[PDB]
Amino acid sequence: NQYDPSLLQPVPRSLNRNDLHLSATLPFQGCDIWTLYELSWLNQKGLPQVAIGEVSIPATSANLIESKSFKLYLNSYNQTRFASWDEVQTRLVHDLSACAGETVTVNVKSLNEYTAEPIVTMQGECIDDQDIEIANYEFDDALLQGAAQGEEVSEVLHSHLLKSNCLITNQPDWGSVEIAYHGAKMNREALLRYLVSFREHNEFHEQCVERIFTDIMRYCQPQSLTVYARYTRLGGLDINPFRSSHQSAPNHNQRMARQ
Amino acid sequence: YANQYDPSLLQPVPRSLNRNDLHLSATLPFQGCDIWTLYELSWLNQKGLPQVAIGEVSIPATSANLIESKSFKLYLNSYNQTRFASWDEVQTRLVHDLSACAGETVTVNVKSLNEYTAEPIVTMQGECIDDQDIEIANYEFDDALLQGAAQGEEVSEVLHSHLLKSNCLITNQPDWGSVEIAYHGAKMNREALLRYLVSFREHNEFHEQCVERIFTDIMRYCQPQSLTVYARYTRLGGLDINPFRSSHQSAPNHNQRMARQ
Ligand SMILES: *C(N)c1c[nH]c2nc(N)[nH]c(=O)c12
Numbered sequence: 001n002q003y004d005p006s007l008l009q010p011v012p013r014s015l016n017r018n019d020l021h022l023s024a025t026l027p028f029q030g031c032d033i034w035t036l037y038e039l040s041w042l043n044q045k046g047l048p049q050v051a052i053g054e055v056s057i058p059a060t061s062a063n064l065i066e067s068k069s070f071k072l073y074l075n076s077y078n079q080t081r082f083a084s085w086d087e088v089q090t091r092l093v094h095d096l097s098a099c100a101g102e103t104v105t106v107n108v109k110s111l112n113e114y115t116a117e118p119i120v121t122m123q124g125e126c127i128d129d130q131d132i133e134i135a136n137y138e139f140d141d142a143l144l145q146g147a148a149q150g151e152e153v154s155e156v157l158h159s160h161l162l163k164s165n166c167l168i169t170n171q172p173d174w175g176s177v178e179i180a181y182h183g184a185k186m187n188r189e190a191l192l193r194y195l196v197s198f199r200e201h202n203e204f205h206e207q208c209v210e211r212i213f214t215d216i217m218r219y220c221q222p223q224s225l226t227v228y229a230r231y232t233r234l235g236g237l238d239i240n241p242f243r244s245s246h247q248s249a250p251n252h253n254q255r256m257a258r259q
Numbered sequence: 260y261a262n263q264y265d266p267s268l269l270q271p272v273p274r275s276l277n278r279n280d281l282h283l284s285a286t287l288p289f290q291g292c293d294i295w296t297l298y299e300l301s302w303l304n305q306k307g308l309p310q311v312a313i314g315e316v317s318i319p320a321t322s323a324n325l326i327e328s329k330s331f332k333l334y335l336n337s338y339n340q341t342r343f344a345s346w347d348e349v350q351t352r353l354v355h356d357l358s359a360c361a362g363e364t365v366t367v368n369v370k371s372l373n374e375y376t377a378e379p380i381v382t383m384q385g386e387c388i389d390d391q392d393i394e395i396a397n398y399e400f401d402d403a404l405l406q407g408a409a410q411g412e413e414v415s416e417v418l419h420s421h422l423l424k425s426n427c428l429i430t431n432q433p434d435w436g437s438v439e440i441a442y443h444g445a446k447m448n449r450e451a452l453l454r455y456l457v458s459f460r461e462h463n464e465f466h467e468q469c470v471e472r473i474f475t476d477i478m479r480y481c482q483p484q485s486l487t488v489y490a491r492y493t494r495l496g497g498l499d500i501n502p503f504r505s506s507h508q509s510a511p512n513h514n515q516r517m518a519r520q
Pocket residue numbers: 064065066067068165166167168169173203204205206239
């Protein structure tokens with residue numbers, strides 16, 4: 001029951017990126033922001049410690065980290081004595097960086113750092129309140145065909161209706177997604193239908209955001225695009241992939257209502 | 260095809276099974292409720308467009324049964340591809356089905372996500388007992404850690420800890436919780452109390468069960484005049500449970516989430 005870095009399992013980003021027909025020179029920059037709600041270990045005297053971990057994995061890393069393996073790796077801390085909070089931080093940076101293949105950022109935060117922090121919603125216009133009929137739940141990226149026919153705009157849209165089925169467990173993925181762009185104005189009905197069409201599609205959170213980014217790019221051809229999704233946790237860990245034309249990281253990391 | 264609405268997925272567990280092991284009678288030493296938060300509630304409207312909400316449920320501690328958590332999650336997943344005419348219908352079905360499973364009327368609120376904007380993450384009341392310079396090496400459950408724990412002057416105190424952990428009975432993963440203990444009685448030794456709470460760490464529990472054991476152990480070893488034990492656990496499978504048990508109080512004032520929830 002002791003600390004065991006061998007439990008981490010990398011998954012290469014190249015599998016789905018090749019399925020999206022991306023080259024190794026990526027159309028986006030960004031990162032996967034993870035929240036570790038259940039981080040716990042023993043101090044040097046055996047007294048339990050609890051914290052929330054905030055992790056950022058660069059989107060250029062060769063691998064993402066499979067979430068269940070990440071949970072089991074964290075559970076291996078639970079019965080292990082560490083000298084200090086700094087030692088825990090150091091071990092997390094080392095093991096997560098080795099797994100992902102690029103340096104990962106890790107903040108280990110005491111629970112009192114969250115007291116009185118507010119829940120946030122996303123920015124700009126919510127596209128969800130449309131009186132439309134959904135006839136089927138098949139994924140269809142052609143729902144975006146001709147979706148960006150309007151005048152040149154810069155705007156931020158979001159939806160709370162993103163759902164997909166997790167590839168390896170068949171359990172539901174729940175997310176909110178924010179889309180900021182400069183380009184021909186997007187048809188809201190087409191964008192909503194496209195997102196709803198993920199509902200029974202097998203996905204990982206990271207690849208779903210990459211698919212949304214690359215489908216919007218190809219069908220809607222904005223000049224600038226940022227897609228940031230915030231998913232509910234699975235097994236005590238959540239993932240918030242951020243992909244952008246121009247931005248390396250989001251300027252905010254705050255929890256939403258279902259997270 | 261996803262399974263659609265299926266109330267037969269709900270699994271009742273009689274509260275009396277474990278209460279028997281606590282040597283309780285049918286006449287309970289406590290009152291209270293189990294407050295559940297349903298972070299993943301989603302269904303389709305009559306046109307097939309997804310709806311999302313957060314549910315809040317209160318189950319009376321006098322109900323014959325509690326509801327097994329995995330079954331509750333699967334029952335809620337059965338809504339995900341089911342069409343409902345209104346939010347009111349969803350709320351009404353949740354009340355009906357969860358009341359039938361528990362054996363007593365339960366309260367349900369189905370809230371739009373916008374109701375949560377600017378809502379706080381909260382801590383618990385009173386003094387945190389966790390920052391102690393003590394050594395622990397034996398994690399096995401021991402209620403006798405509370406022997407002689409309340410010797411002090413008569414006081415009213417509120418104490419809390421974030422260090423509650425146990426192992427989830429059926430599904431066998433760790434349970435993470437914070438627990439608030441309010442009492443009036445001889446002052447409790449904080450080292451004994453913390454060692455006792457940490458002794459749950461490798462013990463198989465339901466959350467509801469662990470709070471009732473904490474309540475009944477503090478009553479028998481410390482004999483306060485009045486006591487409330489309230490724990491807030493992190494979610495499993497999108498739902499969390501927050502059992503409240505008290506000699507004199509009915510329910511907590513709100514259902515605000517804590518940092519890990
Ligand atoms: C399901 N959505 C799932 C299961 N394991 C996962 N790992 C990662 N990194 N992302 C996911 O979305 C995962």
